[PDB]
Amino acid sequence: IKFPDQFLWGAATSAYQIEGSPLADGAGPSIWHRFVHSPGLTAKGETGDIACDHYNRYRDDIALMRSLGLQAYRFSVNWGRIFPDGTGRLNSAGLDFYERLVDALLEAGIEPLATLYHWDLPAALDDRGGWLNPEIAHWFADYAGAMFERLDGRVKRWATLNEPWVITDGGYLHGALAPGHRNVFEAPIASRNLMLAHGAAVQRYRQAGKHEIGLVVNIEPKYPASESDSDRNAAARSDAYMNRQYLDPAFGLGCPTEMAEIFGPAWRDWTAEELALAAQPIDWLGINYYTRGVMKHDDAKPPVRADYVRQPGATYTETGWEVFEQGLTETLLWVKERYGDIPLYVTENGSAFDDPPTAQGGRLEDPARVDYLERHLRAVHAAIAGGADVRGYMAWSLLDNLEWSLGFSKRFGIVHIDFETQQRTPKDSARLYSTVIASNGAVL
């Protein structure tokens, strides 16, 4: 019915997934460039060389965001456009692109939200260890520092990392994402070093910044596939490994015991210095929610030894994700009790359904996506009613984008992208969304 007053309504993107032009104006290549251009590593070999050509069209996209009545825009910064070597020399053409992006955002009345790391680590720092090298903490702060020094007054809500769990589990445990590593020993190393970079960036911001800084995690609730002891233990083990592995350190609760249990010899406790530098007090927290997981035990999938079980009669999306809006409510209230009264922004939520390649008549009819949006907005409202102090909502995504190694076949946008012509077309999802913003949910 009605959301809190001054609730921030926006949409979310990420640098590599929309920008394209990965090497223009002296930008250093990222791990995702090397990844998508080596054969065999992605579904159809689709790259982000063009994506949505957003790099050249940010003015048209910002005008479109004004047309849709958006109040916030959540984007990420391509580190390689800032420091082509990841360290040292700073090419200010890319830095200027980001500063102009924020300028145009702010002169259309839109509050810019910046993700400093959203998976596109420069290849130069991969060459020097990537997220295996602990010097990454320093390399992150110097990156973050520069960004603050340029736009901290205008960008006023910063996030350090986007979904560290997807970063590690896909990039370092199963090699499904850049930089394609498959090693049980590496995943916890990269997890710790990600959190250390996070803490170092928060400290750098506290010395240099005046506004807000936080972190973005994905959360996927867990349910046992049966009431077997092994299915139940698998569900709790996935829940710890996925939901708690990163929020507990950030909030100074150490790391879950299931890290040790799951990884065995591959695990080591963090030192009190590591934990101390990770647990830096932050201003806000961003939660990315899409679905729940109903977990079954599978000895064949170590180290976690859990697998997903499809629910019969349940609805799934083009990514195999169950429509389970109740988990969003559960997630937000859970975050509240476990971690405190920190303000919460839903930094990602949405769905992917089978849309045609182009729009006819200037319309793109996506009733399933509209339905998902309604259910989950009501779920957010139910959470806020239950005491959850949520201050914003970011629909993933603003535009149909690349979606990493799954390629352009999976469309998350409320605005349709005709990828052959870069034609923007607001879907029915987007029109309902702007009705939601102008009424602040009353239409629901």
- Does residue 163 carry a catalytic annotation? yes
Structure tokens, 346: 């839903």
Structure tokens, 109: 């009345």
Active-site residue (options: 322, 330, 348, 403): 348
CA 142 to chain centre: 22
Q: Which amino acid is at 263?
A: F
CA distances, 209 to each of 141, 154, 158, 202 (Å): 12, 11, 10, 9
Nearest CA-CA partner of 164 in 139, 189, 134, 129 = 189
Judge contact between 442 and 57, C-beta under 8 A: no
Report the C-alpha gap between 365 and 380 in whole angstroms: 24
Cis bond leading into 221, ω under 30°? no
Q: Using CB atoms within 10 A of its CB, is residue 153 exposed (0-12), middle (13-18) or buried (19+)?
A: exposed
Report H helices in 268-422: 272-278, 326-339, 367-385
- The DSSP symbol for 308 reads E
Q: Which amino acid is at 308?
A: Y
CA 318 to chain centre: 18
Report the C-alpha gap between 443 and 19 in whole angstroms: 33
Report the C-alpha gap between 79 and 340 in whole angstroms: 32
- Does residue 348 carry a catalytic annotation? yes
Only one residue has tokens 């020097």, namely 128
Active-site residue (options: 46, 163, 258, 325): 163
Nearest CA-CA partner of 36 in 168, 141, 176 = 176
Report the C-alpha gap between 195 and 247 in whole angstroms: 10
Query: What count of residues does the chain have?
Result: 444
CA distances, 246 to each of 45, 294, 316 (Å): 31, 21, 27
Inter-axis angle of helices 54-67 and 92-106, nearest 10:
10
Query: Which residues carry out catalysis?
Result: 163, 348
